[PDB]
Symmetry: D2
Subunit: 410 residues, 4 copies
């Protein structure tokens, strides 16, 4: 009895060879994440056919041996940014998937700014599930935050020096109910560059115009007067920032701000979790305790090869709801260069502290099946990339981002 990815790779016709190679790589990882939490084999068929139909044709070329073919530059390896199996209370697990949609010729003179890929993905995904992709907030924010093809081409002198010209990042929530849901993030770096204005105020003026044009409530001030201090702006780098939203009924979506910090102390980092003390609550401390715990847990160890750790790379993401005056944080510790053995150890014993034993077996099973390297190699660095925490009203939001393309790094 074959598995859905095996059978499908046997029977399916692929438009392009690179889609076949991406299938061989990803489809096992994806299928095992789906089949190691219980995605009904039919739903596996459905999501794998969406992956075969919508996202892989919108992934860009496959990394060859010297990644000679990768022409759309990035500080990350080619392919997905992550595969985002997340665990919450009551054994509710779900599979998520982030990709910066890359055209087959993005980063080349035929598609210098990678303009179509995101829209082709959106359109294909709406055609697959009609009525499932509401385009309101996309319509409102694409003018203010993003930059279309022609505007980027007229002002190429302004943004050429930028290394990563990323403007649209799409995350798929592959619901267990076969009803995949799109999420879009806009980094305004090219916008703030050509307009020569600060990231802060373009982001917040966009959210403000949306607030008034929509009438919906998005409390956005506290983020602003924190991210606009100077002690903050000395430690973070504001230009690794974006804000995001769900392509849904704008009465249901959210607006998440997101930025990056290189911090020395966990106390120092408490600012980002707290927006400088402004954003404080009975749960703002619940979450920060756990993140500091896992912080010194995974930073207790040494780097592979005795190289010294000077600072610690964290990422941060707040979100603002439409119906209430609330905004909540979500912290990441970047672990791209640690011991996969140590990272896995910290993950599993943190889980054990939570008592997430079902999730523990889930994690180890997904590990062994989807990522053999962590056992075949004692010195291993390539499974995990980010360990993300966030406490919400009834539980933490710990997501273990992976590189489903780690097999290419071995």
């Amino acid at each position: 009895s074959p598995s859905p990815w095996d059978f499908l790779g046997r029977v399916l016709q692929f438009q392009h060879g690179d889609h076949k190679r991406w299938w061989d790589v990803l489809a096992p990882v994806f299928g095992i994440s789906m089949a190691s939490i219980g995605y009904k084999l039919d739903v596996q068929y459905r999501h794998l056919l969406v992956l075969y139909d919508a996202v892989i044709p919108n992934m860009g070329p496959f990394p060859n041996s010297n990644a000679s073919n990768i022409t759309w530059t990035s500080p990350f390896p080619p392919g997905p940014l992550e595969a985002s199996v997340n665990y919450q209370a009551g054994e509710s697990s779900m599979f998520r998937f982030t990709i910066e949609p890359v055209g087959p010729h993005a980063g080349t003179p035929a598609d210098p700014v990678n303009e179509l890929a995101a829209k082709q993905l959106m359109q294909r995904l709406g055609q697959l599930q009609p009525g499932g992709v509401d385009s309101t907030m996309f319509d409102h924010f694409y003018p203010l935050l993003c930059v279309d093809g022609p505007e980027a081409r007229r002002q190429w002198d302004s943004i050429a020096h930028i290394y990563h010209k990323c403007h649209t990042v799409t995350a798929l929530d592959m619901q267990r109910s076969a009803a995949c849901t799109l999420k879009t993030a806009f980094p305004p770096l090219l916008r703030s560059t050509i307009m020569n204005t600060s990231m802060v105020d373009i982001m917040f003026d966009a959210v403000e115009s949306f607030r008034k044009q929509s009438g919906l409530y998005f409390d956005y001030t506290k983020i602003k007067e924190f991210m606009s201090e100077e002690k903050t702006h000395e430690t973070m780098m504001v230009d690794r920032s974006y804000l995001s939203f769900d392509c849904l009924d704008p009465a249901k979506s959210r607006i998440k701000i997101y930025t990056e910090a290189k911090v020395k102390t966990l106390e120092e980092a408490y600012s980002f979790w707290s927006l400088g003390g402004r954003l404080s609550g009975p749960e703002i401390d619940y979450g920060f305790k756990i993140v500091s715990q896992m912080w010194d847990a995974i930073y207790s160890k040494e780097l592979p090869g005795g190289k010294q750790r000077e600072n610690n790379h964290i990422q941060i993401n707040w979100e603002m709801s439409a119906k209430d005056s609330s905004v909540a944080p979500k912290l990441y510790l970047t672990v791209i260069e640690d011991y996969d053995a140590y990272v896995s150890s910290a993950i599993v014993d943190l889980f054990t502290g939570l008592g997430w034993a079902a999730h523990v077996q889930t994690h180890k099973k997904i590990e062994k099946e989807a990522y053999p390297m962590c056992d075949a190699n004692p010195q291993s660095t390539h499974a995990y990339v980010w360990i993300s925490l966030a406490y919400k009203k009834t539980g933490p939001y710990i997501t273990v981002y992976t590189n489903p393309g780690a097999s290419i790094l071995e």
Copy 2:
């Protein structure tokens, strides 16, 4: 929420447009037969992907409006010879389909004898399910019964006058366990023609050589004793005959002989059921009672338009097992030219005679969903083609062959 055929037609890439049109026609009928008895949705996906992968690329071109493109002539309409949901007691219904594999150019000077299609289907089907296609009996009988490409091409003067140059017919048992099983039938008409010998003789000499080479027991004497007579040979058409076998472990396969009769009375038809009285048992009359029952049932009615019925077109199929010394009959009433309303009424009230009500609702559901015409048109003749009967050790074997391409006849 789409259905597997809808979603799949949306996402699947088709190698050829004719495969797409055949999909649009068949896949609803096939999928509704599958989902109208309970084929689990992932099993539906599997069988529909087999149909998409194995059988549709081996079905030949799609009938256009004047059927101008059909170059592989036949007395039947293009497409499957039947789609043949079978019913047995204990609510045991299963789906099976018959096709004369036609190459995309069969019946043209590039493939004048349609040689490859069957082997390509066999090979593809074994590649899909390895170890699931045993080729023993095929290997033994392809030399004696069938005719390869080169032999048929050397002796074209001999068989050119034949209208239907059919030599290999493949039936798929689309098991509910996703494990489709191939069946092959060989009509020796071209063989008996070029060799200028009697059908009876080549058929039974082939089965005899297999009996000795294999040691297995295939009692074939009584069939020969009956089919060799003259009172039989005056009424039946001996040239619409084949023998069949399952591509399986030859310790598990069977050998079925098959022929056709134009009979006047049911009494005179009792011969074929009984091989002239030789083949007799407690069940030989059980099945005959029921076939006479439905015989006078569906023949009591008139033909559409007052055309007179002179005789009755029946088919017959005897079967010989390996482990024992037994041979059993299975009769067919052809209903290609009758009232779909009357044919349906006879089916439902015969079934309702068995008490097969679950099967009754099953039949009417498959009717309304897969065949709207029987209601949209009071005068309708195009759903059913054959009503087949056979009584085995426990229950009857009533199979309601349809034309899944009836919609093409509207």
Copy 3:
């Protein structure tokens, strides 16, 4: 020995069946226009592979019999707006082809404004011939004239009442040097609608901003002076207007304005040719003599079936160059509803008076081969759609627009 379209339809794999059917229809007409003026056979292969690769996947679905599958509404039949072999002196004939790029789902809730198709066509066409698609003027005018997806979706209440929501029309000059050249036209109807401003104003303000941003000289005053009047605006329909440009080195492109008139006398039509007397020269009357000639020629005849002709449907296109201060007209007589026999006779004897005998045989050859109907049917109306005239510095610019899908209308 096959022909390129025959051989290619034999060997090529098509991504979609509709591309195959469009191939069967168009590829003969296109290939016969190419091979009926002398397009070298490998150049035929190249252009036919471009048509197979770039334009047919961007043509939208194929008209089925009741044309249910056409969801992107229009006052014209589906397919190209024309196939437009143009003739000039010295036996200089070239092939060109207009299409309103339609997405496979344009006019449906997945692509309500047909946004991507034009950009996908542009991108594919640049990928095929790198460095051959300069995007300057597209970049400048896409903001001012056209409407993107999100803007059109936010203001759907404004433009929903419009019947034809056409915003981008692409013409391919299939050069005999295998170097196809793209041309883009923008009708500002949706823009002028949502902005609730006059077509004249947005068009000329866009050209003015381009004049200042680029420094190049596009004399646009006289066109505005004439189109702004009222005696003009009572007879012409101002909303069937666009302006166009070549995707090239903007030091080489042009800007053509374009509109449509329902005129009673040729005298009263002289205005559009002359912009009310402002646009006058030695050639302004040269071209007008010839258009009045063919006007009374093809209007002297009656309509098929005795229906009366009240007015005459003409189109007009003025052009402004960059290096100089000039603007030149080009008139059209619509012949969609006339006798193909009469239309053909007028074309051939116009040519004969002009002495274009080589062009005469060219025309009749393309007729018989690509359009059999004009002979198979004495009463035929379906070959030609537009007879366009323009006299430039040396010779006339008579282009005989056809419907390469006329066979679909039979």
Copy 4:
């Protein structure tokens, strides 16, 4: 301006990724052989589309780095057995290409004897050029020499010990007139094995039955008289033998016998050229002088790395015509394990002595363009495989077989 293979790889859709990789490898070599003797560009398109359509889908999988995926074993590397530009006087050079058609699953339990690939290639090739593939001699010899699928499967115990189970080899003469011509060779090793009879006997009995059934004259006596001896049979390997024929009008085809020898002196090799003195003429010694010439030429050098040469691997091919009573030889020196620099030098100075200067530049051009390695690496062994000689009624038949997949060996 691209080249046909570049443009085509850009525009063509490939059914399988392996076809794309084989395209990337072969299509440059094939196209440069075509365009380095003058194959007209549209003829290049035609042959490259045949290679894209007929032969590459019938080439088997592409060698990955460890070559795990070649499941059809062989003593040669995967891909064509050669790419075999042939040179004759009057600057008459033509391209031809040999392949053992391998199914995508040949050598696996779904296709253990690689039965279909040759017939699929034949059928496809006839469908492309109807009337261009006469199947007479194939029909006559497929029973006597070859072994079908079922016969090979019944007697698997007999031929399992054989390493190379090759039974059908197809050579394409890619005529400069776009009219490719098929050639088929049958090695009877599996036949002579299962029948347990001598190769000589089955081969010549087959040719004899064809002689009587057809009436045509194929003088085969002297070959049998020589190959039946013992002094011959001690030095030559009789099991690397086949006989071949053209799929054409059997009044035009030929029958070539073919075998292989490991010979010590050129004197002792003169036997195979001469069938032991029986086959003698004015040209029998003409060709032998030249082969001894190039023999001592390319064997005077040493092997790369000082390994000693004990004997010399030669191949031989005699040919029998239909209209006359003649049989002519054609010898081969295998150079698989020599200095590409030395092999090339011998080829070019042989040519130079022959005065084939145009052919000299042709050879060096094809070398540099299609095979860079011979210059990038001073120690190179991988361009050439066979240097074949034969002197016919006017000039020699020197064919320089290459490995068009040499780049895979780097």
